[PDB]
Symmetry: D2
Subunit: 460 residues, 4 copies
């Protein structure tokens, strides 16, 4: 432990700590959750501070040697080398000013090790305020999370579902509506439905990016840009785009809206929440399809991933659909916290940013990781019980309707009843009731009862 | 009372519905609230378009189809809103309300001498599962395009007009509710206007999927027992007759019946708009707070006496209506997502509940946005001189004095200005700082609070 | 020209529909708030009428109001309470958040009624004597909610509990396979499952009763801000005594703290949490029941639900129940949102909170009785099918754990599935009948009804 | 050499050489890398306590050899104490029964015992008489009950006491009431704080009211609630040991063993109380930051203690952000709670994460709020009295003498002419037989108008 002195007081910080006094005071002020910023927010703070130093150097406001040291330090933070140097609670001052100062202090300590003296506020925070920085970092992280990680994971899941839909194009089975027997579908058609939900999910995320990517940087304390260069925003954004390749980043359409509100995070959480709703449907159908082996639906077999029960030997459970539906619940909860924070800004500043940031970035992370796992450890290895599915379809009261024009709906209903009673196919029941004659050939019967043709699947 | 038929069922004399509707009436006495006029309208539009297409394809006799088209137009025109008694909380496919529509059409046609079978004729090529969701998405799409977006535009334009009027009305900023550097009222209102403009963008961005219709998918999405092009033909007629260009056949017919994800998506946009409106309305009632113990920045138009007991008091009732509507939209949004997530296999069976909530959220936001615009925003007046005096008295504006008198003396100016409740300018003077290091002209340039707000400068015209 | 008359308030003159019993302030509110198109419910109008009568009674008792005026208010308030004048309450739910407009609606309509019997009442000075909207509208709201809880919801839940409990008794020995993670588990009885459902509803009643000490708190007497200004010091205790006497609801009480009772609506938030928990319970019960009724061929086909429209019946009441639960969850979020956002001496989200909490009580009340009477009571069990499912679960190997150990039991279950044999046959075929396991042991242990430990 | 082979009924698994977990835990490490966060200290504590108690009872009943039971009890005590938290690597977002974390505890106990020369089978011995399906929700409800009783209620009591202390200190500090954000009649700062204190007091009542069901434990129901493979009194014996060790008398066996496993309704109920407390805290914190606002542009009614380093209301901001998180967590909890199927609700680890977090946030921020914000507030007494006297609504007690409509005209003219209400009553010639100047000055005393009660 080393000793430091702010105005006014003495504070002890850990010897290995690169943060300084203001960060240590915040550590002492907010012992609330014990959880600090995630890797992605820390990275984005590093990206922002490097770009700001670049621009301050470019405009002749910051000595090049100082700028170069900030840029080098900030690069180390952005590269994830100092994730342990950010100890401040998520539940901190609502502008995120404490984490902003944490970044400035850590950068100055890194630079000191290379022989360059940096003032955390006067140099590392030059042209910035305690209010346009943390939300800028939040939107960088969220935009990067969307574009570089979530959309590719969703595409991977989409592609897995679509491949199954193709494999199972002719795997006929009974539809279910209201959980009751219905006319035939194919397993491929159902999975093409799941694939569309994920594809629409990607479209939903893409549609929020024009506003998610808006950055407040340059608006300084109240959105007016006082004490910054007039073009600071567009210059900093240009550097960030050039360096990251994230072309979705842009200066805000209105500098006051970009600090008074965090509506872009609320909008984006809505898209994540819709994806959670879709994933809930997909995962719950899939675990119901896999239910059994003997007292359930037994339509498909999920890959085994681990023993199911500490007490019931040999049982295996749909653990990936469970992870997906729990993740979806968490995204829904996080979404409510985000909206609550978003609605409650006042005048020139929304002061729920650290909480909103935690929730939106966690939702991105959970959906990204569980989507890849779902695709790779569950969807890819599904196998269908093809004969079981076809037998139930061919035995269903739902398929007697195309018999009506041959034998009348009365006799069709009798066929339906006897088929259930004897657990027979409709076909065999028609034969056993002696209905094959000049009225109905066996070839006409097989045409009328072609359950795959009833599913009306496009041939390829 | 009349008797019908299984049977036997008693139905009110002047009722155009028949036995199945009356059964549903007896099965679901839950909320006492039925379909809204917009949903009834959409069912009418859909039934008329289906009859047109069945007629075109030679599946339905022209005189039967003509009778359906005439009856459906009456329903769509709002002539029979009292003929749909079934609870919202009905069978989750909306099949009861679908049959309600079929029965009412058949009764209307009967009065014209034409006999229609509610199922075989009016429900021809349709199922108990692709129709109610189609009508829901028609209603929601119309609500978005024909009503909500124009109402939001009206509010945007009213906010933007105030931003323009108040372009030079300088005041102190507030961050964390604490004194901050100068802004203008016009800047704040341009921020509010952007939030509403962004709200319109959000609604527009959900329309490609909100406008997707299930019609043609029949019982499970396969289109069994309908013509293969039933969907595209019905959509063609609907778009031609209504002008609702956003309507389209669904990209995937199973997704369009197994899920209502487009309603969940659209509710998110409405919910974000509710979040924006909460900010805007809160700020405005705080700006209007007082008259003497609050912020007193602006005056809201009086709309009614404030209090049954405190005489003369007037309250920010339009902001209250807006923030209460926003809470309702947030609650409706949670119900919609809950319904959306819980479909099974080929059918989501939460449609009537989801429909009730999404359409009510459209309606509330539409109506309160226009009232907010017209009865509050349009008539706001600013206490211009009060605002400016507070800005000119702020410790936050001494910074541009630093390069003239040093930051230590600037802090002393700040301290003294507060203690004496004087402006910074007057304090600088009262401390004898005006000499050859600082002329009065220089002082006024440095302490120009409007320039500190950095408002955009307009051109010479 | 003869379509309207002129009324006035402190803001000026207002044209009012000629036949309307309301006056200037109601009419302003009609024009200010055309938002949802829906006004106060019957139950809300009743509680407002009841409250106004009770206030006039107490003002009469204390000699503050002339008995002739007091009697006219009490007479008119009773007409309002009984539902004679619901069409004279046109104001939207989404009005000023104190309910000022609906309070004046009641004052003005009472004044107009009393005018027809020859008595002149000032809507503020007489009908609203000793009162504010800020204590009377939350009081009317909590009266309605307390009444909904005690007189309607709890009895409806008890009816549902009793229907569930009767099935648990009737089906006490109907053995079936338990399911966990949706996969084949050890035996249970249908009766045991329904005893679980009954407990959830019983616990639901316990949750509603636990909120009553704060739901029943009334703000009446606090007037403008909670200080009681312009009311007798004992106005609250006296009005509540009249209320208790007239309604029979002993749960109504004066607030513990008069400032908390007006600055916040925390008791409505609290009560919504109990309703939301009940919606969560109902979702589980209804989902299980529609899955048990599923199929028959493609589903579990465990039970048959009564057919209501008009054998493969759609589970229409489970669908109504789970949709109602979704609504209660949505209403609950709206209520908490309004609840959190009070400022200083007043929470101004009351009409919206009232709309949602009263609707949640109504939906749960009505759907629970329907569910109990028209679904639960007439359920029939496919007893032989259920026993066959119980017998076929590979997890019936579980009671052999103490005899052959977890790992060998797992090997048994897997082979039985692979070779399509019973567990008993597989235990035999694996040569496990020996020193530490006999056929007698299996007859004892593999008995599926005994395994359910009923 | 950096790994070893372990096995389960699904096959062989490579496990890090130094790890005390075994095959099923390692499978779960690979199956669920989702959030990157595992069980909390309190959850691992409760799991350790529970395994120890189970071994004690199995020993008592002669079902488990004493030296095996002793080894389990000793290992479980080390886990409970926190010596092995680094041995619990499994994600929160695992199988929804918590099977993986249950086997995590079983495997780590087996490895700890092996070091002392005792061989335990993770299933047959450490998991004897148990399922994940009764033990994981039992450990969850133990942890939740302990959080409520030993941590949250004392934290709320501390906040209540700090607020009540201000209500006393400021009992006669008169100010203007505000309703709809507009000028109302007088209140005292103390009266307002007595309202805040009651909200927190009611919050404690709300937490106390959920304990009879929060404290219900599924232990003994094993796989589905029937108690199969467990002694008929396993549950009650285990609960007695837990109550004795923890001192938590609120722990109890479940009223119905099927409800206790098929649903997690007690967590949903408890979250509702926490959500209500968040709603209260939001009102309290908002009022306090608005009272401290400005000073020039705001209300400037009170001064908040400066914490870093015009002081920003950072603790009210922490409180309102925590409340938002509690509301979010509460929605996640209800969602998981609703979606059980048949004999098991499979959202337990997610529901546990969220309810335990909500307890923790409310506990810690309530203590910080009490000590570092509420206790040091100072009132601007003269400014507050000036606000009270300036409100035009102070005309209200004249209603009985001049009627509502005239009093309204008085308030309107006072505002217009920038005069006091007293002068305006005079200017309008209202002093007469129905209102003397002595009555007027009696009725307009703002402290008296606040009607603060005798102490
Ligand atoms: Cl297809
Ligand atoms: Cl390790």
């Amino acid at each position: 432990y080393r000793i430091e002195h702010d105005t006014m007081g003495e504070v002890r910080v850990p010897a290995k700590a690169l943060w300084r006094a203001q960060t240590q005071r915040a550590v002492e002020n907010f012992p609330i959750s014990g959880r600090g910023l995630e890797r992605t927010q820390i990275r984005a703070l590093g990206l922002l501070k490097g770009a700001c130093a670049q621009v301050n150097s470019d405009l002749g406001l910051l000595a090049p040697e100082k700028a170069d040291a900030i840029i080098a330090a900030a690069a180390e933070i952005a590269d994830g080398q100092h994730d342990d140097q950010f100890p401040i609670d998520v539940f901190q001052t609502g502008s995120g000013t404490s984490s902003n100062m944490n970044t400035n202090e850590v950068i100055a300590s890194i630079a000191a090790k290379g022989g360059v003296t940096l003032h955390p506020n006067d140099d590392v925070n030059m042209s910035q305020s305690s209010n346009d920085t943390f939300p800028t970092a939040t939107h960088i992280a969220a935009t990067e999370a969307a574009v570089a990680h979530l959309i590719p994971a969703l595409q991977q899941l989409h592609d897995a579902l679509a491949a199954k839909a193709l494999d199972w194009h002719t795997v006929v089975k009974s539809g279910r509506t209201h959980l009751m027997d219905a006319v035939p579908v194919t397993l491929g058609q159902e999975f093409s439905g799941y694939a569309r939900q994920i594809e629409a999910g990607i479209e939903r995320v893409r549609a929020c990016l024009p506003r998610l990517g808006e950055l407040a940087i340059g608006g300084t304390a109240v959105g007016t840009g006082l004490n910054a260069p007039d073009d600071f925003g567009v210059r900093v954004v240009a550097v960030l785009v050039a360096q990251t390749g994230l072309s979705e980043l842009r200066t805000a359409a209105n500098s006051f809206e970009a600090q008074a509100a965090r509506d872009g995070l609320v909008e984006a959480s809505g898209a994540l929440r819709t994806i959670a709703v879709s994933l809930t449907k997909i995962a719950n159908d899939i675990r119901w399809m896999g239910s059994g082996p003997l007292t359930g639906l037994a339509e498909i077999q999920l890959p085994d991933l681990q023993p199911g029960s500490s007490i019931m030997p040999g049982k295996v459970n749909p653990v990936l659909p469970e992870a997906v539906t729990q993740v979806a619940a968490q995204v829904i909860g996080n979404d409510a916290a985000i909206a609550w924070g978003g609605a409650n800004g006042a005048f020139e500043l929304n002061v729920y940013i650290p909480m909103m940031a935690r929730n939106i970035l966690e939702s991105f992370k959970l959906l990204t990781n569980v989507s890849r796992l779902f695709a790779q450890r569950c969807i890819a290895g599904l196998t269908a019980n093809v004969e079981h599915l076809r037998r139930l379809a061919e035995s269903s009261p739902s398929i007697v309707t195309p018999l009506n024009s041959a034998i009348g709906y009365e006799e069709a209903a009798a066929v339906a009843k006897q088929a259930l009673k004897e657990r027979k196919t409709i076909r065999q029941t028609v034969i056993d009731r002696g209905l094959i004659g000049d009225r109905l050939s066996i070839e006409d019967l097989d045409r009328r009862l072609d359950v795959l043709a009833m599913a009306k699947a496009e041939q390829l």
